[PDB]
């Protein structure tokens, strides 16, 4: 009741701050000609991410540029408005920080601190797999991040190595929040990425924050094995495996790791760790985490097992054709994005 009461008090203040920012979001805190473009870091079906330099300060940022017309075409208005509203309201060491946002006739812009270490995904595929201490270090950060997000009644719903950055201290930054939803009870949308979907998302019953603990199990498995627990040529075949209740482990997994994963990759949501009476403490007190100093992880005082090569450098991102950023003379989709 010292450590536990400190966390309760911390989370109560955190919720008060979150709700104030959620109710009165920041808007229009920069403009495009404050920035020079350097390089395209990523492309998607309705936007791009660009490395940019702030002209006055010289600071580097990742600028997410979303084409309003394409957002409307692909039915992503609510997700995009939600992502920005969440990002400007949350505050936690392992969440990316929104520095500026604004819009113009054509685009929405979210400007975030640049993290040159890139995605966990690339590092994992390059090295093959992480040792269990390395995986555990990242897993502990996700456990704490979900403890925070769930205390705000947010379900995260898109955990995967693609959405985790590794910063220059070797710690994680969670990137994407469009799918994050306020859920005190249950929700029903089929959304996420096939390999990481909990059975109850596939099966069309309502679901709750316990899906994030299932996804943690998938992430830990993929980090430690180099491949996810459920894979196949086509998503429908992946879904059949997920709901089956059967999983196999590499022979190099420790006994403690297998026991944790059997309890996270638990199809019966009423038996799944994270979702029992003692909540996240069943995970934090599990034998696999016995060596984890949870407070030291939160304070970023643990020496990271891996620090990306320090080189403005973009070597941890792929190369893309550089295309114009065109801003129309006509305002597009103004009413739809009024709150951005």
């Amino acid at each position: 009741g010292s450590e536990q009461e400190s966390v309760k008090e911390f989370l109560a203040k955190a919720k008060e701050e979150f709700l104030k920012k959620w109710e009165s979001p920041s808007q229009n805190t920069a403009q495009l000609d404050h920035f020079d473009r350097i390089k395209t870091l990523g492309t998607g079906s309705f936007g791009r991410v660009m490395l940019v330099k702030h002209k006055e300060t010289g600071n580097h940022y990742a600028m997410k540029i979303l084409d309003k017309q394409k957002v409307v075409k692909l039915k992503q208005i609510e997700h995009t408005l939600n992502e920005k509203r969440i990002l400007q309201a949350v505050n936690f060491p392992f969440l990316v920080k929104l520095e500026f946002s604004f819009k113009d006739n054509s685009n929405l812009y979210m400007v975030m601190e640049y993290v040159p270490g890139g995605e966990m995904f690339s590092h994992l595929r390059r090295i093959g797999r992480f040792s269990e201490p390395h995986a555990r270090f990242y897993a502990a950060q996700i456990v704490l991040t979900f403890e925070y997000l769930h205390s705000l009644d947010l379900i995260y719903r898109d955990l995967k190595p693609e959405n985790l950055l590794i910063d220059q201290q070797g710690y994680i930054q969670v990137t994407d929040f469009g799918f994050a939803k306020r859920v005190k009870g249950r929700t029903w949308t089929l959304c996420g990425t096939p390999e990481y979907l909990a059975p109850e998302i596939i099966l069309s019953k309502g679901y709750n924050k316990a899906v994030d603990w299932w996804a943690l199990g998938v992430l830990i498995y993929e980090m430690a094995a180099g491949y996810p627990p459920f894979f196949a040529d086509q998503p429908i075949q992946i879904y059949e495996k997920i709901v089956s209740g059967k999983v196999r482990f590499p022979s190099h997994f420790s006994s403690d790791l297998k026991d944790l994963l059997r309890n996270l990759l638990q199809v019966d949501l009423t038996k799944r760790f994270g979702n029992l009476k003692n909540g996240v403490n069943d995970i934090k007190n599990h034998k696999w985490f016995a060596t984890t100093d949870w407070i030291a992880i939160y304070q970023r005082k643990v020496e990271a097992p891996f620090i990306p090569k320090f080189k403005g450098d973009t070597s941890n991102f792929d190369d893309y054709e550089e295309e114009e950023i065109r801003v129309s003379i006509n305002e597009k989709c103004g009413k739809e994005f009024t709150e951005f």
Partner: peptide, 18 residues
């Protein structure tokens, strides 16, 4: 091996949301 089956699945690159 299971790894070989993972490679054969074709889903070794970045994965999109559904």
């Amino acid at each position: 091996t299971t790894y070989a089956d993972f490679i054969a699945s074709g889903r070794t690159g970045r994965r999109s949301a559904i």
